[PDB]
Amino acid sequence: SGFRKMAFPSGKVEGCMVQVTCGTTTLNGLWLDDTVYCPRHVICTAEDMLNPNYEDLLIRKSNHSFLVQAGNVQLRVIGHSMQNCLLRLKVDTSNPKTPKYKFVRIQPGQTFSVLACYNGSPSGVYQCAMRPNHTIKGSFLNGSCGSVGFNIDYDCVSFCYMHHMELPTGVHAGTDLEGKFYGPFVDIQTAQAAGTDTTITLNVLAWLYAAVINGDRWFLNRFTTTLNDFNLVAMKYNYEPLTQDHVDILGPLSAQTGIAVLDMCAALKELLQNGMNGRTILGSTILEDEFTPFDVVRQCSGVTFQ
Ligand SMILES: *C(=O)[C@H](Cc1cnc[nH]1)NC[C@H]1C[C@@H]2CCCC[C@H]2CN1C(=O)CCNc1ccccc1
């Protein structure tokens, strides 16, 4: 029993973290096989950043402009290229700890684990959702760029995020591992802000199912809703609209618990209208939205408590 934000074991990723230095800028990169990935802004100084031209900054560097350290082993760069907002550095050694992996561009509302690193050195790990506004509520200090986000499925690490920057509100922005920002952001010091965010409706409902799997039913009711009248209600309360595909996704949890997805939607609808009456769900005073349907199935028992 219990229900906690839980990240994936970090070992496989830890053995991929290196330090990348260009001039007096230092950050993290990811070493898989004979390449190292890192934020391209490592070639910038504080002067450059606000209006940099990466192409023009980069042609001005050589391979030995880049210093790559793996523990205390110096790795020699023998090639480099830019790919969107990411540099790929080719090194003279293939990482012996490379795990099976792929890269994935994750969708808003999905979750990943983050290995926070400084100076190539893993310091901590937490779990984050991709917000609808394409931010993540991370925990990151200066030097944390190049830290990655990932999921693990069997033996295989699906890398899906690398950190670049922090926004005025204190949330974080970055790219997938082909260098393409999540959201409308750029790696320039520009007057860019988090857009308005929304609550992830699919995850809230998933987490309500979690509560029922672990034995709690207090927030249910006798009513049902149309998908459409749920959405009139959802919008008022700044929840994402529920679609039929989100309904389909909850089938397996609907089936484990015997609560119809639209009956659970009427439950949520009532919760939004009335509050939680000083009560808690899975230990929270508030509705939670950073657990996905998959996260619930992964962590909860396959046998419901009653
Ligand atoms: C990652 O290493 C950090 C980002 C970070 C810090 N805390 C959470 N996340 N690098 C930030 C760099 C690069 C970004 C590139 C996009 C535009 C803004 C730019 C800001 N960065 C800075 O380092 C600015 C910090 N100011 C500063 C002043 C004086 C001395 C050091 C740093």
Curated annotation (Swiss-Prot):
It catalyses: TSAVLQ-|-SGFRK-NH2 and SGVTFQ-|-GKFKK the two peptides corresponding to the two self-cleavage sites of the SARS 3C-like proteinase are the two most reactive peptide substrates. The enzyme exhibits a strong preference for substrates containing Gln at P1 position and Leu at P2 position. Residues 1-306 are cytoplasmic. It is found in: Host cytoplasm; Host Golgi apparatus. It comes from the Viruses. Residues 1-306 form the Peptidase C30 domain. The active site is at 41 (for 3cl-pro activity), 145 (for 3cl-pro activity). Cleaves the C-terminus of replicase polyprotein at 11 sites. Recognizes substrates containing the core sequence [ILMVF]-Q-|-[SGACN]. May cleave human NLRP1 in lung epithelial cells, thereby activating the NLRP1 inflammasome pathway. Also able to bind an ADP-ribose-1''-phosphate (ADRP). May cleave host ATP6V1G1 thereby modifying host vacuoles intracellular pH. Monomer. Homodimer. Only the homodimer shows catalytic activity. This is 3C-like proteinase nsp5. The chain holds residues 3241 to 3546 of 7073 of the full protein.
